[PDB]
Amino acid sequence: LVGPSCVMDDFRDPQRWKECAKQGKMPCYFDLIEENVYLTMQCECTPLSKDERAQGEIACGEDCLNRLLMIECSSRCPNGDYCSNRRFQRKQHADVEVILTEKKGWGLRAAKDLPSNTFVLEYCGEVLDHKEFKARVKEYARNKNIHYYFMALKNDEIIDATQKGNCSRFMNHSCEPNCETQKWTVNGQLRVGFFTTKLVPSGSELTFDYQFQRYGKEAQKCFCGSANCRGYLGG
Numbered sequence: 001l002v003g004p005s006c007v008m009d010d011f012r013d014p015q016r017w018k019e020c021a022k023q024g025k026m027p028c029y030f031d032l033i034e035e036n037v038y039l040t041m042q043c044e045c046t047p048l049s050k051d052e053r054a055q056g057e058i059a060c061g062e063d064c065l066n067r068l069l070m071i072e073c074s075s076r077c078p079n080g081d082y083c084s085n086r087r088f089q090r091k092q093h094a095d096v097e098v099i100l101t102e103k104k105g106w107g108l109r110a111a112k113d114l115p116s117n118t119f120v121l122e123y124c125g126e127v128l129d130h131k132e133f134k135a136r137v138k139e140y141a142r143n144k145n146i147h148y149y150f151m152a153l154k155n156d157e158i159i160d161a162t163q164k165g166n167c168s169r170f171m172n173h174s175c176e177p178n179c180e181t182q183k184w185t186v187n188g189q190l191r192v193g194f195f196t197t198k199l200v201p202s203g204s205e206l207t208f209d210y211q212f213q214r215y216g217k218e219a220q221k222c223f224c225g226s227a228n229c230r231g232y233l234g235g
């Protein structure tokens, strides 16, 4: 029987959320953040005219030199306000809902049809060095945590959404996924977001290939239900 669901603005009210959580209508409480917290040149697109914008033309589309290198434009973009290549900065997230799944805990699902290569959410959290990361793997193992929230960012940068993050921390694993991670440069700094890899029909769960290093721990069985399921989680 289909579990409860909630919208992303429900996580904005901490008092109502802690109450919903007590009744199992929302996931367990966490610190909601909109940007990563660290524990320790313009493109050549020709500006669109007032007529071109009114006509529906795309500013900094697929041929944008910044977009092509997975770099977001700044406020100085030649297209200014029109620039469609500032999705992370403008929080131009896909319309998704947080749902209770049968056996994987909470998950994410499309609340509208999502075209292929659509920006879903940024994966936010506490950014750790390799030392802090290993310390937290051991602490989470000791505390018998069930769910994993680490995401590789770059050398000596691992995002941990265990304690602080956003609703991207709820994306589940699938052996036949419909999303992927992409690393994007924003103001000379690397960020990671989820993107659909195919058309995602409304009401479908959003999934990705959760590539995590299993550090000699007992294998977690995978409940993705895919015909080609690998049976276990982790890379």
Ligand SMILES: CCCN[C@@H](CC[C@H](N)C(=O)O)C[C@H]1O[C@@H](n2cnc3c(N)ncnc32)[C@H](O)[C@@H]1O
Binding pocket: 027, 103, 104, 105, 106, 107, 146, 147, 148, 149, 150, 151, 168, 169, 170, 171, 172, 173, 174, 210, 220, 221, 222, 223, 224, 233
């Ligand atoms: C990139 C961040 C991912 N964070 C967790 C998702 C949210 C979680 N469901 C929650 O409610 O907080 C990942 C955890 O969800 C579980 N999960 C994910 N996919 C599967 C699967 N296919 N089979 C069985 N278990 C799975 C598993 O415990 C995994 O460690």
Ligand SMILES: [Zn+2]
Binding pocket: 043, 044, 045, 059, 060, 061, 064, 065, 066, 067, 073, 085
């Ligand atoms: Zn451009």
Ligand SMILES: [Zn+2]
Binding pocket: 043, 045, 059, 060, 064, 073, 074, 077, 078, 079, 083, 084, 085
């Ligand atoms: Zn631009």
Ligand SMILES: [Zn+2]
Binding pocket: 174, 175, 176, 222, 223, 224, 225, 226, 228, 229, 230, 231, 232
């Ligand atoms: Zn699977």
